[PDB]
Amino acid sequence: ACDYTCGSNCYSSSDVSTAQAAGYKLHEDGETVGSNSYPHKYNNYEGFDFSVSSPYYEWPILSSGDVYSGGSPGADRVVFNENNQLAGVITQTGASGNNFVECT
Ligand SMILES: [Ca+2]
Incomplete structure (x- = not known):
């Protein structure tokens, strides 16, 4: 099962915590990639x-x-x-231009 589904992409709670930890570190370091x-x-x-x-x-x-x-x-x-x-998991998938939609 998927904890978060974005279009056709399935995500587990472990995927979201691994992601967020990487991003958060970059934010603390004042860095970007x-x-x-x-x-x-x-x-x-x-x-x-x-x-x-x-x-x-x-x-x-x-x-x-x-x-x-x-x-x-x-x-x-x-x-x-x-x-x-x-806060949440979002996607551009299904959305026009500059919109986003939530992952379900
Ligand atoms: Ca995964």
Whole structure:
């Protein structure tokens, strides 16, 4: 079973914790990786109901289980906040342009 399903990508709770730990470390180090500079601020224009408060940051999560190191980020992402609390798992998959949709 999937703890989080983004389009056709299945994710376990272990996948999301491994991702978030990598992103959070980069945020503490004031560093980024990839052409689009991740992690970077996430604005919740879509009004997703997060039970953790902002500021929020996004980091790519990959379908392969590897942690993101540069190269193609895919469409999925973890969103965490300033206290290193998980907000939710989101995707561009099924969404136009600059929208996101939640992972289910
Ligand atoms: Ca996995």
